[PDB]
């Protein structure tokens, strides 16, 4: 039983004690690159998430598939944690190895309130992943239509944006 398990399970006292030892590296990922913050965000462990952020955990850390903690919180529908990560300047349009952003996962898993919160905070709806799919197009129809409407009212341009990054071409 290690720091990763304590973060997954929400053993706040154990996590606190572990963080008290400054020789421990609070950003270090496990075997698949999941940091303590990734696990806490994935499993909805709000108090542990706050503790890690306030004690200086890097917010945009990536695991082996280039998911950030925000991707995980969004995918698993942890609304309070999404809001906390955004408060502390998480990159709302962070891309993983597939070019997916957190909104792709909120949409795909019907995490409607997280999806709406993301768009309210400026999350781009029109940005294709590496396979040409925009985040809102992973949603069921009601949510898909809603997020486009909300994005439009937030001053987004709704033109489809094909995937690009520094190494793409």
């Amino acid at each position: 039983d290690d720091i990763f398990t304590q973060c997954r399970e929400g053993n706040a006292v154990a996590v606190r004690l572990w963080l008290d030892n400054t020789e421990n590296d609070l950003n270090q990922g496990d075997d698949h690159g999941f940091s303590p913050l990734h696990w806490a965000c994935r499993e909805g462990r709000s108090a542990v998430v706050e503790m890690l952020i306030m004690r200086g955990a890097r917010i945009n850390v990536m695991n082996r598939g280039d998911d950030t903690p925000l991707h995980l919180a969004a995918s698993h529908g942890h609304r309070d944690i999404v809001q906390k990560l955004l408060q502390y300047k998480a990159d709302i349009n962070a891309v993983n190895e597939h070019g997916n952003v957190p909104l792709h996962y909120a949409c795909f898993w019907g995490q409607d309130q997280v999806a709406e919160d993301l768009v309210a905070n400026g999350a781009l709806v029109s940005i294709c992943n590496k396979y040409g799919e925009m985040p809102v197009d992973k949603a069921k129809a009601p949510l898909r239509e809603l997020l486009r409407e909300r994005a439009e009212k937030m001053g987004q341009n709704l033109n489809r944006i094909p995937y690009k990054d520094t190494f793409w071409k």
Binding site: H32, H98, N100, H104, G110, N129, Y131, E133, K138, K140
Partner: protein, 72 residues
């Protein structure tokens, strides 16, 4: 898994997204679970499983590549 053209019960729902099917819709049956075509895909990349092969982690289904990157 197999491709089917839906003409079943109005109570039938997708195992992934819980939504219903339309008459004549091309759907997927995997081990008795019914899916929309867009739902019988890897939870990480949203793409079809190569050779129909998936790997389960905590209630979600993953392609080999993503299972190996994240969970194996």
């Amino acid at each position: 898994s197999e491709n089917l053209y839906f003409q079943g019960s109005a109570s039938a729902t997708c195992e992934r997204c819980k939504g219903g099917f339309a008459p004549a819709e091309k759907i997927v049956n995997s081990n008795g679970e019914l899916y929309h075509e867009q739902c019988f895909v890897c939870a990480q990349c949203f793409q079809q499983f190569p050779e129909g092969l998936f790997y389960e982690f905590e209630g979600r289904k993953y392609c080999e590549h993503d299972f190996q990157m994240l969970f194996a």
